[PDB]
Amino acid sequence: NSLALSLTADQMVSALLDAEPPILYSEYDPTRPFSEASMMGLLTNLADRELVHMINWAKRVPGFVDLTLHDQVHLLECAWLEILMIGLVWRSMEHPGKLLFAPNLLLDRNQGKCVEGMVEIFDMLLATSSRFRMMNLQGEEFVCLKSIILLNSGVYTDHIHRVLDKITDTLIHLMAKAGLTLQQQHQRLAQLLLILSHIRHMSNKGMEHLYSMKCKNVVPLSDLLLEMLDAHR
């Protein structure tokens, strides 16, 4: 029997809020990147550091700890980029037209376009950020979505499903607490969950781009990123 299923909505929200990894910084060099080398150097370095916090965050998502190690590994292998991406989108909400990779690293689409294949992904991220903003997405809602991605993305490739239901219960509780009518609640739940389809899409396209970058073998990639990337091919 998993402890996760015994938590109340409020306890689930607190658990997830408390598990949030911090927002990390990029290098303090004030040089705005405008080349594949510089930009991807910064992005992979950041991602590498964030991954370590993500791994420890995952362990704190109710129900994740009840999985075998092999299952935990699979979920993380499937979801890591989706999770990095939804974090980026969340951080960027308050900066229309900008992607806040870190507080000292805001990139725009004019920088994306100095790297073949990048602007299309940047533009998708920006649109997702805009969507979040116009939906007035809340932090409590964000942490639920992120947990859903972790548990759902690799789930095919009963426990997980029961935990996923609990997170749904928790999203509805949040919306009811915020005063939404019953119709507004199901409409909003659907809206949030459909965005996960787009997050998946961006991760998949990103993954393709990174595979290409890996082969070009110019951008330095950590062994951990290599393994995370390898899991997808």
């Binding site: 370590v52 362990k59 190690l69 590994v73 993380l76 995370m228």
Partner: peptide, 10 residues
């Protein structure tokens, strides 16, 4: 032999 196997333990 996966790094993730190690990290998930500690």
């Amino acid at each position: 032999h996966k790094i993730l196997h190690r990290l998930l333990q500690d």
